[PDB]
Design an enzyme around this catalytic site. Structure first.
Site: not given
Ligand SMILES: Nc1nc2c(ncn2[C@@H]2O[C@H](COP(=O)(O)OP(=O)(O)OP(=O)(O)O)[C@@H](O)[C@H]2O)c(=O)[nH]1
Ligand SMILES: Nc1nc2c(ncn2[C@@H]2O[C@H](COP(=O)(O)OP(=O)(O)OP(=O)(O)O)[C@@H](O)[C@H]2O)c(=O)[nH]1
Ligand SMILES: Nc1nc2c(ncn2[C@@H]2O[C@H](COP(=O)(O)OP(=O)(O)OP(=O)(O)O)[C@@H](O)[C@H]2O)c(=O)[nH]1
Ligand SMILES: Nc1nc2c(ncn2[C@@H]2O[C@H](COP(=O)(O)OP(=O)(O)O)[C@@H](O)[C@H]2O)c(=O)[nH]1
Ligand SMILES: COc1ccc2c(c1)NC(=O)CN2c1nc(NC2CC2)nc2c1CCC2
Ligand SMILES: COc1ccc2c(c1)NC(=O)CN2c1nc(NC2CC2)nc2c1CCC2
Ligand SMILES: [Mg+2]
Lengths: 431, 123, 427, 425, 424
Positions: C91, C137, C175, C246
């Site tokens: 996305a 996403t 974000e 709960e």
């Molecule tokens: N704790 C944690 N946070 C994550 C991880 N991967 C991404 N994030 C957090 O997720 C946010 C970015 O979202 P993502 O989940 O990587 O994005 P996505 O849902 O895959 O969506 P798109 O890549 O845009 O298609 C940021 O704040 C990242 O630090 C992870 O493996 N662990």
């Protein structure tokens, strides 16, 4: 989001395009025959971005080479790695554009453009998931600029959902004596504001200044300049070409760097600066690279970043170095220099590290900035434009090919409009 | 004054008079019972019929409650369904219109190119 | 009976799913093939006839990169391939692309696979949804999924585990737009959302574990331990168990006020050379071990759920809880006479070998609904207003079909929510 | 009037009901296999009020076990005397109640109730003359209170002529399992007022306060509380289980103890107070008035007793007991009502509870019981004034009108208990 | 023959019945199996074709454990199953359940078994009814029976021996209600009612018999000696009180005032011989009255003395003359100041092994004194204490009684006490 289709148009376009393909080929362990001879799967992991997989376990650049002048094609095929290119992706024509935008955009360029669109259709339908297109060209000439922007908008019309990205070389009277380059450039800028998603601004003025002032080359040639271009193009496509913690693509860059659709002209920067084919007797430290990156001498556009503010910055470091130390010094430069970052775009500076260095450097850094300070470049073009257009200098070269004074007047106010909105946001308050 | 009363095998009786009296002389059907018993039964059965009636009212409230919650779920589903189909159709129409506008401006430009090539022929 | 369907969305959601399902397998002794040498793991693990135990999960991502590692990883056989759903294009950090443009092309497929998981359930409790706020996403496709789950399954329980964004580990500058957008659209559809601040996890792995620059695997494996504590009450038979219903009933005083605050203890370095029930309970109310950055001392508690695991006896919990309600520093609202819910499962916390956390006898995870979490909404809202005042980046969302109206509505709803956290703290 | 059908529902319902059968099976001499081997026949004379006789010279409690959660009754099966219960009297759903009265009374309770009523109906038909029902449940949770009060209403519809008797445990923030205890308890008291004949108020507040203060236990556990409850349940059923001159039953208890149909909530008392593990008759008499010996958190010298039943257990003089009882009533004249003469009946039964030589048990109808309800009322209003957690109940279909009618009713019962506290002769 | 039928209603009525028939069987020489080694006993005992002597008696208690005592007791062989009537649920201390709920269900059965005993009577005098005031069966069913007996056996005599409630040994708080309910409903249909105050009997057992905590059976043994002395001259061929109508003629000059006061002496502990003059002095001690009241607060209307055992007429009148001189015994103005006296020569008999000691001579005095009205005043007050707040009324109403019956019964009791004060 994998495959990119690459287009190079005109003399400048094909010569910097050539050097790009030599450089990333060496990085990716591909020889001119097209064979992989490297030692790391990392060189092959994302190779589908720029190269088609071929018979004989060969690799052929997903590349289309274009010029109205027949000579540059022979020069490319003669050049090192000339044989690597698909021979049917060479589209050439009968005579040059005579450094005339309207010849490239409206008359002769339009005869050839359908043929170019055929080669593009093939390379892009052979793609699983097409990111989009990157174009190398000049804005001062007639083909890369006039047929280059024609090609852009025609590709836009067929592929409106793919990213349109250009490396665009800006003219400077230091490097070319051709007087109508301000016209060709202001015409092209019009089309680029409207029809591309990302444009790296590669300024001949900045390139000459670097070679003369920092490299002490009294009389720099296009080869001296193109070394600086080739280093940048390697640097800004590192994260597409090599695996990283972020899976960068052209659209994720556009989304995070372009806060307003028109303000999509990036100021690239590189450190360290070197001369072509010159042994480097000692690399640089990470804090060094960090500082020298926001230094006006290290910019490929002739703009002083301390004269405006950054809307967004992306920084690529290459080599074996501590990501701890990198994010450290990077944050330090942001705090000490907080007046040059816009306050109303939080966390607007993103940095990546890739263990793989470029050839000949132990450590390098590469900078992609969206700074309002880029208005300086456009103002310089606009001034030169006005100087000539007040006098209607050379205007019959363009009306002879069918254009009108109004189209000129329009592209000037549009660039001036661009200048004024770069200013609007430079003076913009969070409060 | 002792006055003998009677005598028998296992008994003897008499009367002792200490003082004579001052003054001379002395100064429901089976149907009604059955009716009163049947009446107590009738009101006993009436109060028991009132208790079950108010208990049967409680059962109907309980069904009304379960029914309401089923109606609430169904009305939540239907509102969500119409919300989503309205949003997705507005977003499609908006996206398609932006793309239509992007192609129309480009087409006006390639009309201009035909016009520019005409002027060249004219002269 | 009592089954829960886990759904993992986008990069963050999927990568956390890896750490969690890995840990579940170790906690129940399930090999990566799904076979094993207390039938409570059936709430999360269906069984094919061969004795293979298949997680009740769908992993979804709009890009195949992260999910292709699962397909080729240690647990490639753990899942059926039809549970691992991917498209071709992510996305590009854009809610509007996760919810509409790209999202709509795979939404039907995902619901069909969910429908089939629901068919293998005889007593479905609800859905757990793992996602990021900031990803394109994580935001827009989860919203679309939540909306689509409410039409298919009505009011059936829906609980989230959400990653709150951090500068240190962000990957995108839009974000805050993604966060506010998905929160507006998901609010009506989620019964309870557990929020996790990447900054807070990051600062814990740095102070308590002495990792200089924590990786996602570092963050994620600590986040897993917490998720395990929440779901252990459903995956294990313990003395005091808490089911999904709960959770919602004891933590959510009002439908919008449904964002509990997670805490966990002890977090100690494996290499450093036991802690009592009191010590780990007292440590839940210290702000250092919070999963979100906020000051509960400046807030009022509306509901505290403490989930102990390991060697923990009910007397010593009630003694530790006795001490807590004497602390004036810990303030509850007027309208809460009873604020505590306690559960105790007896299997010690399992640690992934080759990991950084130490094996402990007893640990606890508290979920508390404090008005203090509004500080975290205030921080996101302000980043949103910085950019939105200049309409920075908004064209990208308009271009994918959204309207500016959706931005203001989502922000106004966040403004109401901020004001709601104010009203409920009034005495 | 012989057989009692016993019902336990929900977690607390089933935890205390299990210790009840644990205790009285020890008294009547029954081992967990169902075999009898005590040493007195007085242990068997009226053992058919609680046990069915199996053909194998066995004895099976007339006991039905209910929960919406499967876990609690599986813990009972594995507990000490889990062998003894008829296995097909376990009626358990599996979605649980989620601590919600509306779920136990309306939706999840409805779907399990007819299966429970069928087990009730089969124990009733094997009964020569059915006396009534004794139910053990909490009011604070979802099952024992939501589903329990539903059970009650539907048993009263099928058996309107039979006595309905509950042991109803009252919640306290001092030992809580859920934040919505005030809603559950208050919606349930409304039911209890209108549909039971006798209710013993088991106050978790009073249980806790006794363990902490008298028994000196720093941190009371449920076992400590349930040790008090088990001693109480044994004491109040003593005259039903062991023959005495009174021939007691549940209908005569309700007739002599309940002067007005709404006022049927009893304060239980016990002496001596004992902890798990570890005395004179005149003093046994006095612990009647000690609020420290009460299992509802109410001070009897805060009101008046309408009626009192006292059981004395152990070897002791029925002359000495009767003397000290009357002396208490004369000295504390002001705390009994004038308009009910001779309102304190005493039974003495020779059989002592286990580990004790002398015990006394008090059943009181005191206007002071209004304090228990006023405290539940204040907790209810603190939450309901803000509609806290209300949407979980409205989501189950309840109107909020049911909430106000349930407290307006419970406040009426408080004012009704007050009205007779001030009534004079 | 001059036959009398005994009916026993409720637990008190039945357990006292056992103590009487046990005493009768010892006084007449009937063994427990029925055999017998004066034919006047036949007024109380029929005979079978097998040679056995069967009490003319009906027991009615709707609780089977009490009847089970009779059918498994020592004298079980005497009784025939058709004489014992039982049920499942008792009246739960509720007159209304006894009179209205149970009574509609068993009245015909009970009357039927009674009809069977009367068909074996060539000249039936009437009935002796034993019941409590306080129990719900003793009060509620007994009153209905007395209504039905007055319909089915018109001019036949109806005596009752009514246990009067004592708080010391009583079972229920609503005993004052049941007492005023049954008295109101029985008043027109009884010819003579001897009351027995359980507290009077209790006090006598404790002081005279050295029993600190008397049992029901200690009271019943003592009650039987009283019942015996009253019935002695019906079961032997005596001279005073030889048929049931003579009780009403010698003791009930006014029909509503038909509650005599019985006084008995000597009561001598077995653990430990008195003259005719001292047992006669003992009849004017309130400590030996069966009902607690002071005969100085009232005038007498009649007065009979029933000597038993070795007593000679000269000794009796000698004992009588001493009383006139030193004590005052005010009769009403319209009645003669004096006594009727009977000696029955058959010696007073104790249960062997009991706590009453065999004595050579005894006496029972029956007197109709306005002082008995103090007993009704005591109950009247407890009734009003409770009925003012309507305490416990809903139990009675729930059985189909009407509230107004409480008020109707109370007003009748007011009327009775005014009747007692007018004559006095
Ligand atoms: N704790 C944690 N946070 C994550 C991880 N991967 C991404 N994030 C957090 O997720 C946010 C970015 O979202 P993502 O989940 O990587 O994005 P996505 O849902 O895959 O969506 P798109 O890549 O845009 O298609 C940021 O704040 C990242 O630090 C992870 O493996 N662990
Ligand atoms: N940096 C760089 N600039 C170049 C190079 N070649 C030309 N230029 C610049 O390009 C501009 C003129 O563009 P051209 O490349 O000659 O034009 P064209 O598109 O090839 O068109 P025609 O030669 O007229 O057919 C001037 O500003 C030159 O300085 C090159 O190799 N490197
Ligand atoms: N003297 C004497 N009094 C008794 C005896 N049994 C009961 N009573 C008294 O009778 C009163 C209660 O009357 P009962 O006849 O026992 O009651 P019931 O009608 O058989 O029983 P219910 O149907 O349960 O009401 C109380 O004052 C008892 O003390 C007894 O054996 N002897
Ligand atoms: N005295 C006592 N109270 C209990 C026990 N278990 C639970 N409770 C109380 O019961 C209430 C919660 O009810 P619970 O029985 O667990 O819920 P249910 O299974 O939904 O009916 C609270 O007031 C608890 O304090 C127990 O074993 N003993
Ligand atoms: C202002 O904040 C951001 C700036 C840039 C980016 C992001 C955030 N986040 C993203 O995911 C995309 N991204 C980048 N994209 C590409 N694309 C390749 C084509 C050059 N290269 C690079 C970056 C960062 C390092 C080099
Ligand atoms: C106010 O007076 C009374 C109170 C209670 C009762 C009675 C009178 N009398 C009864 O016959 C029934 N009953 C009782 N029932 C049960 N069970 N246990 C006990 C008693 C009294 C002794 C313990
Ligand atoms: Mg992604």
């Amino acid at each position: 989001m994998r495959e990119i289709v690459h287009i190079q148009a005109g003399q400048c376009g094909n010569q910097i395009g050539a050097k790009f393909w030599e450089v990333i080929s060496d990085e990716h362990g591909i020889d001119p025959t097209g064979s992989y001879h490297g030692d790391s799967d990392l060189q092959l992991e994302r190779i589908n971005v720029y190269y088609n997989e071929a018979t004989g376990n060969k690799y052929v650049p997903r590349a289309i080479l274009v010029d109205l002048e027949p000579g540059t094609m022979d020069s490319v095929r003669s050049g090192p790695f000339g044989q690597i290119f698909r021979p049917d992706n060479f589209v050439f024509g009968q005579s040059g554009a005579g450094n005339n935008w309207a010849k490239g955009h409206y008359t002769e360029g339009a005869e050839l453009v359908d043929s170019v669109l055929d080669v593009v259709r093939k390379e892009s339908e052979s793609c699983d998931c097409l990111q989009g297109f990157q174009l190398t060209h000049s804005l001062g000439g007639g083909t890369g600029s006039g047929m280059g922007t024609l090609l852009i908008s025609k590709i836009r019309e067929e592929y409106p959902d793919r990213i349109m990205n250009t490396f665009s070389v800006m003219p400077s009277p230091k490097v070319s004596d051709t007087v109508v380059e301000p016209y060709n450039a202001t015409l092209s800028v019009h089309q680029l504001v409207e029809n591309t998603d990302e444009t790296y601004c590669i300024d001949n003025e900045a390139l000459y200044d670097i070679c003369f002032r920092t490299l002490k080359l009294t009389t720099p040639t296009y080869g001296d300049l193109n070394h600086l271009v080739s280093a940048t193009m390697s640097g800004v496509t590192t994260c597409l070409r090599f695996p990283g913690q972020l899976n960068a693509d052209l659209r994720k860059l556009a989304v995070n760097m372009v806060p307003f659709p028109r303000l999509h002209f990036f100021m690239p920067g590189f450190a360290p600066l070197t001369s072509r084919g010159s042994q480097q007797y000692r690399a640089l430290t990470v804090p060094e690279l960090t500082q020298q990156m926001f230094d006006s001498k290290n910019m490929m556009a002739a703009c002083d970043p301390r004269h405006g503010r950054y809307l967004t910055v992306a920084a690529i470091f290459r080599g074996r170095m501590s990501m701890k130390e990198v994010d450290e010094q990077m944050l330090n430069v942001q705090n000490k220099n907080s007046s040059y970052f816009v306050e109303w775009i939080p966390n607007n500076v993103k940095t990546a590290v890739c263990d793989i260095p470029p050839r000949g450097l132990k450590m390098s850094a590469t900078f992609i900035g969206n700074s309002t300070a880029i208005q300086e470049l456009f103002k310089r073009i606009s001034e030169q434009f006005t100087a000539m257009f007040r006098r209607k200098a050379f205007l019959h070269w363009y009306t002879g090919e069918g254009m009108d004074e109004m189209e000129f007047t329009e592209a000037e106010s549009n660039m001036n409009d661009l200048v004024s909105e770069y200013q609007q946001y430079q003076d913009a308050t969070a409060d | 004054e002792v006055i003998e009363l009677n005598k028998a095998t296992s008994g003897q009786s008499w009367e002792v008079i200490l003082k004579p009296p001052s003054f001379d002389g002395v100064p429901p059907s089976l149907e009604e019972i059955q009716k009163k018993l049947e009446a107590a039964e009738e009101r006993r059965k009436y109060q028991e019929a009132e208790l079950l009636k108010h208990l049967a009212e409680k059962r109907e409230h309980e069904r009304e409650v379960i029914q309401k919650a089923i109606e609430e779920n169904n009305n939540f589903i239907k509102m969500a369904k119409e919300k989503l189909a309205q949003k997705m159709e507005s977003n499609k129409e908006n996206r398609e219109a932006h793309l239509a506008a992007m192609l129309e401006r480009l087409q006006e430009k390639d009309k201009h190119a035909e016009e520019v090539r005409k002027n060249k022929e004219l002269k | 009976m009592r089954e829960c369907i886990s759904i993992h969305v986008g990069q963050a959601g999927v990568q956390i799913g890896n750490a969690c399902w890995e840990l579940y397998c170790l906690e129940h002794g399930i090999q990566p093939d799904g076979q094993m040498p207390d039938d409570s793991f059936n709430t999360f693990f269906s069984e094919t006839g061969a004795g293979k135990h298949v997680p009740r999960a769908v992993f979804v991502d709009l890009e195949p990169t992260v999910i292709d590692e699962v397909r080729t990883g240690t647990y490639r056989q753990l899942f059926h391939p039809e549970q691992l759903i991917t498209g071709k294009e992510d996305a590009a950090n854009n809610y509007a692309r996760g919810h509409y443009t790209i999202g709509k092309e795979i939404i039907d497929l995902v619901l069909d696979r969910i429908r089939k998981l629901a068919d293998q359930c005889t007593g479905l409790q609800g859905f757990l949804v793992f996602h990021s706020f900031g990803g394109g996403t994580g935001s827009g496709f989860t919203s679309l999924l939540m909306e689509r789950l409410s039409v298919d399954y009505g009011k059936k329980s829906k609980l989230e585990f959400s990653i709150y964004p951090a500068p240190q580990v962000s990957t995108a500058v839009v974000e805050p737009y993604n966060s506010i957008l998905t929160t507006h659209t998901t609010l009506e559809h989620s019964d309870c959302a557990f929020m996790v601040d990447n900054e807070a996890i990051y600062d814990i792995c740095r102070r308590n574990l002495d990792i200089e620059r924590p990786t996602y695997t570092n963050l994620n494996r600590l986040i897993s331990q917490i998720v395990s504590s929440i779901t252990a009450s459903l995956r294990f038979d313990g003395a005091l168990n808490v089911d999904l219903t709960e959770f919602q009933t004891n933590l959510v005083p009002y439908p919008r006020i449904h964002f509990p605050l997670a805490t966990y203890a002890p977090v100690i370095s494996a290499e450093k050379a036991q802690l009592s029930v009191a010590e780990i309970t007292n440590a839940c109310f210290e702000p250092a071990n919070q999963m979100v950055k906020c000051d509960p001392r400046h807030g009022k508690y509306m509901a505290c759920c403490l989930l102990y695991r390991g060697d923990v006896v009910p007397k010593d919990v009630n003694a530790a809880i006795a001490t807590i309600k004497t602390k004036r520093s810990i303030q509850f609202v007027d309208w809460c006479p009873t604020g505590f819910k306690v559960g105790i499962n007896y299997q010690p916390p399992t640690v992934v070998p080759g990991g950084d956390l130490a094996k402990v006898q007893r640990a606890v995870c508290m979920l508390s609904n404090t008005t203090a979490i509004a500080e975290a909404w205030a921080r996101l809202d302000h980043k949103f207003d910085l950019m939105y005042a200049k309409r920075a980046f908004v064209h990208w969302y308009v271009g994918e079909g959204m309207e500016e109206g959706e931005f203001s509505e989502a922000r106004e709803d966040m403004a109401a929510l901020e004001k709601d956290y104010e009203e409920v703290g009034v005495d």
